[PDB]
Design an enzyme around this catalytic site. Structure first.
Site, mmCIF file in Angstrom:
data_model
loop_
_atom_site.group_PDB
_atom_site.id
_atom_site.type_symbol
_atom_site.label_atom_id
_atom_site.label_comp_id
_atom_site.label_asym_id
_atom_site.label_seq_id
_atom_site.Cartn_x
_atom_site.Cartn_y
_atom_site.Cartn_z
ATOM 1 N N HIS A 261 0.837 -1.188 0.000
ATOM 2 C CA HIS A 261 0.000 0.000 0.000
ATOM 3 C C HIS A 261 0.879 1.248 0.000
ATOM 4 C CE1 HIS A 261 -3.350 2.545 2.144
ATOM 5 N NE2 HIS A 261 -3.202 2.878 0.876
ATOM 6 N N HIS B 20 1.163 5.233 -2.959
ATOM 7 C CA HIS B 20 1.439 6.563 -2.423
ATOM 8 C C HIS B 20 2.872 7.028 -2.678
ATOM 9 C CE1 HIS B 20 -2.226 7.299 0.171
ATOM 10 N NE2 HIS B 20 -2.358 5.994 0.003
ATOM 11 N N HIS C 117 -4.020 0.627 -6.172
ATOM 12 C CA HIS C 117 -4.353 1.292 -4.922
ATOM 13 C C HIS C 117 -5.750 0.920 -4.451
ATOM 14 C CE1 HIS C 117 -5.845 4.560 -2.311
ATOM 15 N NE2 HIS C 117 -4.690 4.292 -1.734
ATOM 16 N N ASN D 231 -6.531 -0.777 -0.892
ATOM 17 C CA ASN D 231 -7.015 0.247 0.022
ATOM 18 C C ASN D 231 -8.459 0.035 0.465
ATOM 19 O OD1 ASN D 231 -6.480 3.157 1.248
ATOM 20 N ND2 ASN D 231 -8.531 3.181 0.354
ATOM 21 N N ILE E 93 -6.759 8.676 -0.954
ATOM 22 C CA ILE E 93 -6.931 8.472 0.465
ATOM 23 C C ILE E 93 -5.860 7.473 0.895
ATOM 24 C CG2 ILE E 93 -8.660 6.699 -0.034
ATOM 25 C CD1 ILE E 93 -8.268 8.993 3.107
HETATM 26 FE FE LIG Z 1 -4.148 4.802 0.199
#
Ligand SMILES: [Fe+3]
Ligand SMILES: [Fe+3]
Lengths: 828, 827
Positions: free
Chosen positions: A486, A491, A678, A682, A828
């Protein structure tokens, strides 16, 4: 001379809105009297060849509708001017204003739209004029002659000079290392290593903030509660309060400190499993809550109505379907293929298993997972060497990466560590069976290496040791999932691509406009993550097995495993031995695990995305020479390798950028990672880890069979469930993780779903708009393909009694924790 | 002429005390009586005439008042030529009966003469005939002293009665009569039940004759009554404490249960959540009609607390491991060490095949297959190697259950299958469950439905396996409760008790050997035919076969019960668990070596058999003494020909010709009343108190039985609601949990095997010595078992979260301890 009417639409708002509303430090002082506009011709003065002079016009207020003010300017443009290619803006007000768009009216051939979507600083903060281009996109060598210099100058503006402390109004994109995560000026126990810039701690770069260095620790950047991102990357200011960044901000800086105020005993475990059931049934009374009613609006799944407030957690989707599935071994193995971390399992190719670590330091490298141990559980089907040849043995192997940390992690109060391996067998109906879990402790404290294998058992003691070994392995998988699958691979590695896109690709570059929706929101989420999720004493450190070594391990995984050419889904599956290229097979890939819901559904999205990217790239790059001669594109790819991922700049696996196909491969990889990769890691987080015994973030105690004492062993035999409770997270760790994971899994009301709405510049070009429509239709079809797969009783890894349907790669969704929906970007 | 003082000691108490205290139906002053006529009986006839001397009299008069023990006193003079006194006759002048503890004769020079009475002496107005009490010396009939021969035979005549009449309270008549008082055809043709015993289709052990009138609507049914008659002294509740087993159970069945039925009124309301099942143990049920008693809070503290609060205690299984009930290994371990260790047997023939009529019950071949088994065990061995090495074992309820499926399936709230469950013994001598087969016979025009379920690697097959386990477990619950427990202990034993009182004098040594093993049983079984196994009783209201439950126990009786396989070694051999091997421990090679019930049971078997051997050999020196004992011979004959009349012609009844024959018969009987009963009784709440582990009923069919698209989707969407819908209702759960907590509790005056001796045993020095050796052997066995539960190689009794096997440890304190072996069937 032609008469022109300029209409400027501005949004009514203010920066830093949420911080006040929830209480962490007028409407008339907001808007300005006037705005200076200048229309810019796309063509230079013919004959002279120099740039025509911009024609100014001051703009004044007019109307107020739907929370959006209009500013108007009626002026006149000489006829020898030519088409308008850009408009320049200067804000005369003493505060910034958010410009939505600009329409130029009165032209015969049509209205001229400019997409601003930008904060325009007060000229007293930055006197430089802001330029906004039309929705027409151009390669550098196709730039209209009257825009060539302003195109280059704006890029110079966004790059800055690599110096200075970044102000909230700056728009400067540049790189720096992760030297901001520790807090040495608060305690030397909060000191953390710099991630990036060395062979030992390689790491992607992040957005440069340039705050002063600490005087106590000169390698550390001083802490701030206002972490800079370039002004327009701070999307939270113009989104609703239910926007991802706003809800996460509220949870980290309001709800979590409130939890820490009522659950003060940081070592208090759950005394009974019934007390865990209370989190969902009765919740937690949190009398401390600043602006408690606001939070009830922002976080309705968490903060409930009444001077004080109730923190109460929704039932996770795993439990709504089968209250008992979390301890079934087949659901444990099913979740490696369809749970929140589908990225770890790989094919076993060498046998026996053997560590690569230095035996002189880490003890004997031979695995304790034996052929005879395996055949005991599979021989009614086939032998070991048969299973190896037919690609039926699979593994999740964290041994070599975790063992070098065991000695140090074990020095941290309230946690421990092992090197671990989980071995699986693919049966004839294409479902996985867990065969073994091996746990290693390296030689330390004068003792030799400790090593044991646990298996599903026929007797109570081995069965309970197996359950505790799963808890440990699951805690390792939680750390690997959160930090690598993740944080690192979406990110973290993506932020340098964003920085380079703004530094090297003009806003009118077509690839910039292709990548833009996939890059929104991420830099600001990451800045909040550096401030409160991956910092010293932050969320992850406080609740995950590795404690203060959590973020370092993601650096080790980056150095050891991450390469750009295996981040695309086909190349990832191939790299893990799950697929081989096969023209006969769907998607060109023969899967050794045929029912692999993440991978099956991911390849649908990959193909759809790739086809969209192909149509877009082919519209602008007709051949290889157009790729090689694009100086911005080449500078972009080069800066990604040499600055953004500087620590890997010399590796041999970076793709060439010479043909349109090279570019398609590169872009599809980036935008697959920001959308479906993602989304798959997520938005299933609360479904599978919301009931934390299914996926604990930490295993706090050693296995009872590690150097047992008679009294401890007897405690274990007497009440084995109490050993599990003492190993599972504390009440404080549970409430904190559940709070964050519920927020991370929630689609905000304004979530932007892959292939649902198009970008302005995409809809402005008829052939691009058509290709986007075909993309949107392909995704809607994929929705219907996935829905049928979840009704197929032959796909036992996604259909069955009490089984959660695999919906995490369904493109479209409503708001909330829905377990489906794939955004364009890491949002997010 | 010798002057003697008699000290009669009478206990202060009255009959039916509880029924008043529990407010369902004379003051300490009026309880006792005025006078007592005592007559001393010499053991010798007139040496001249050869006629019996007459008894010397004396009235006894209320003398003292101490400790709830009022004593009467009588001074009188005995001639010099009377002889040693052998008995005392007693007459009660009071209008109410009274309960004498003991009678002591003081004055004779050779010592005091003590008479153990422990009996209720009626009023002369209800029975005029006086009551005889003998000394603690025991005699075979031919050894009876001359002055006692006729009194001995006439007390037996008194106890037998005249085979007719309606038995009154004060009666002491022991006699047989069939099971025709369980129905209630005089209040619904539905509450009508068949007669058990008499038919070649409803064979059954006989029970105590009650004499009550027949049915005005059904020739073959006996009237129902709130007081069920046992011979007066068998109603031990009257003299025991309120905490006595019979008193606690009377409280539960007649106070607590109706109060639950008064709140929980919906007979189909299931549990909506598993969390609702947990509230039984952590919050309780509010039951209103309970403060009507406020005595229940003293008698049933584990249950009736504080609108009153009924809350249940955590069963021992869950105390060790909240999760063990899910685990397949705990399921299989409990066939060897749980509340029903009697069903598992060795698979000798493969493949399995039914013996039922193929043209009525469908193809007889089992759906369990070699390839199905090898799919799980080939990592260890093939099927042929497994049958040769005795590694496959089965619990097979198919043929006995299949004939009842169609009729039980017509009962709303329940269903039925014929079931098989197969297991594999692995290399560390633990069992693994391999498959459960469920069978529905051709009915309603559909063919035979037959599916095999196994532990699975996929969620649907695993949940169907869980559901198949629930049904199999309901079948084992029914077979355990009706056959392992009710039939083979309580039910088949009552005739032994009747015959003992009918045919063995109270002074007969075998009477005195058997007595403690037979105390309390008859009163408990009367409570059972009234409220446990009746029409709409506890069992019918909560167990899978409903109204067919007792009949099935008659079916197992007729099909399977034989006396010569009720001893533990013969039971093990008959089930294929053991073969005779002089070189193995106990002379038995066990196919399942770590079998906690069988391992521990054989220690008790051997200890008991050596005690019985010592006792018998003291009294019977050779076969001639066994053959010439007309009382003993009439005893065994009446047991075969009248107590178990429907089987009186079977060829397996042991002979009774030698001391060794007698040792075998008695050891079988008293093993059943002590260790057998303890092993199936006192772990009931431990394993079945958390009823999802051992549900008494499976209320819904498997989802894979003629499924509809819609129902199958309900099952896939929320499979734990299928299990809740199958599991007992909230009414059924609260009733069984109430009953099982009571059946598993040792009263404080529980008499444990080999702790205290009988008066007649302590009176004879060699018998006392033999009892002391017995007691020591048992205390030794305690320490043997305690060490076994600490042996990590005995994985079937030792391991993480595992309940130690303590059910056959001989000694215990009060309460639900899960250990301790009474002499008798006491609850
Ligand atoms: Fe995330
Ligand atoms: Fe019993």
């Amino acid at each position: 001379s032609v008469s022109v009417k300029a209409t400027v639409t501005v949004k009514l708002t203010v920066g830093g809105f949420l911080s006040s509303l929830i209480g962490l430090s007028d409407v008339s002082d907001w808007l300005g009297k006037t705005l200076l506009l200048e229309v810019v011709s796309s063509e230079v003065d013919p004959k002279t060849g120099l740039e025509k002079k911009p024609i100014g016009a001051y703009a004044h207020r007019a109307a107020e509708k739907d929370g959006e003010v209009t500013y108007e300017s009626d002026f006149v443009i000489p006829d020898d001017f030519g088409e308008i290619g850009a408009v320049l803006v200067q804000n005369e007000h003493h505060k910034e204003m958010y410009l939505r768009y600009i329409v130029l009216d009165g032209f015969p051939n049509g209205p001229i739209e400019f997409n601003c979507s930008s904060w325009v600083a007060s000229k007293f903060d930055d006197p430089q004029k802001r330029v906004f281009f039309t929705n027409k996109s151009y390669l550098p060598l196709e730039t209209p002659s009257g825009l060539k210099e302003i195109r280059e100058k704006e890029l110079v503006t966004l790059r800055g000079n690599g110096q200075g402390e970044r102000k909230s109004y700056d728009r400067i994109y540049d790189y720096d290392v992760y030297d901001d995560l520790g807090d040495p000026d608060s305690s030397p126990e909060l000191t953390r290593p710099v991630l990036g810039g060395s062979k030992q701690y390689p790491y992607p770069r992040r957005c440069r903030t340039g705050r002063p260095m600490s005087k106590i620790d000169p390698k550390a950047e001083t802490r701030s509660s206002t972490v800079y991102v370039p002004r327009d990357e701070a999307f939270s200011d113009v989104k609703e309060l239910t926007f991802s960044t706003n809800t996460l901000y509220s949870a980290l800086h309001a709800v979590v400190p409130a939890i820490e105020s009522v659950i003060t005993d940081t070592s208090l475990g759950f005394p009974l499993f019934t007390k865990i059931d209370e989190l969902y049934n009765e919740g937690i009374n949190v009398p401390n809550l600043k602006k408690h009613k606001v939070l009830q609006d922002i976080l309705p799944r968490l903060v409930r109505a009444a001077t004080d407030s109730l923190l109460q957690f929704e039932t996770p989707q795993l439990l709504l379907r089968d209250k008992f599935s979390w301890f079934r071994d087949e659901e444990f193995s099913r979740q490696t293929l369809a749970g929140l971390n589908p990225y770890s399992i790989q094919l076993v190719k060498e046998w026996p298993l053997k560590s690569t670590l230095d035996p002189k330091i880490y003890g004997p490298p031979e695995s304790a997972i034996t052929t005879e141990i395996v055949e005991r559980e599979i021989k009614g089907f086939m032998t070991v060497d048969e299973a190896l040849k037919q690609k039926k043995l699979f593994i999740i192997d964290y041994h070599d990466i975790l063992l070098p940390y065991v000695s140090e992690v074990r020095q941290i109060k309230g946690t421990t560590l092992y090197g671990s391996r989980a071995l699986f067998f693919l049966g004839p109906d294409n479902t996985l069976k867990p065969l073994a879990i091996e746990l290693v402790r390296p030689p330390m404290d004068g003792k030799p290496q400790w090593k044991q294998v646990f298996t599903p058992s026929w007797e109570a003691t081995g069965s309970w040791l197996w359950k505790l070994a799963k808890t440990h392995f699951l805690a390792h998988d939680a750390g690997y999932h959160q930090l690598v699958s993740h944080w690192l691979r979406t990110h973290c590695v993506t932020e340098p691509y964003i920085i380079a896109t703004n530094r090297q690709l003009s806003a009118m570059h077509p690839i910039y406009r292709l990548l833009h929706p996939h890059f929104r929101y991420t830099m600001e989420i990451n800045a909040l993550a550096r401030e409160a999720l991956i910092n010293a004493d932050g969320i992850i450190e406080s609740a995950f097995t590795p404690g203060k070594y959590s973020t370092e391990i993601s650096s080790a995984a980056y150095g050891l495993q991450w390469r750009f050419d295996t981040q695309g889904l086909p190349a990832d599956l191939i790299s893990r031995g799950i697929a081989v290229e096969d023209p006969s097979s769907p998607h060109g890939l023969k899967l050794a695990i045929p029912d692999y819901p993440f991978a099956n559904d991911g390849l649908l999205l990959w193909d759809a995305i790739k086809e969209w990217v192909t149509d877009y790239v082919n519209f602008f790059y007709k051949d290889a020479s157009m790729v090689k001669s694009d100086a911005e594109l080449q500078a972009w790819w080069t800066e990604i390798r040499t600055r953004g991922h500087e620590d890997k700049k010399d590796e041999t696996w970076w793709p060439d950028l010479k043909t349109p196909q090279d570019l398609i491969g590169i872009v599809t990889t980036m935008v697959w990672v920001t959308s479906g990769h993602h989304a798959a890691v997520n938005f299933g987080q609360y479904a599978y880890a919301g009931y934390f015994p299914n996926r604990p973030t930490i295993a706090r105690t050693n296995l009872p069979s590690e150097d047992p004492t008679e009294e401890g062993w007897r405690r274990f035999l007497h009440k084995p469930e109490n050993e599990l409770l003492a190993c599972l997270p504390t009440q404080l760790q549970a409430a904190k993780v559940l709070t964050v994971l519920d927020v991370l899994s929630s689609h905000s009301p304004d979530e932007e779903y892959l292939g649902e709405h198009l970008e302005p510049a995409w809809g402005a070009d008829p052939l691009i708009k058509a290709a986007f429509e075909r993309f949107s239709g392909r995704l809607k079809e994929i929705e219907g393909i996935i829905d049928a797969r979840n009704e197929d009783k032959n796909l036992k890894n996604r259909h069955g009694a009490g089984v959660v349907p695999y919906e995490l790669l369904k493109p479209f969704s409503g708001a909330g924790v829905t377990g489906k929906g794939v955004p364009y970007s890491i949002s997010i």
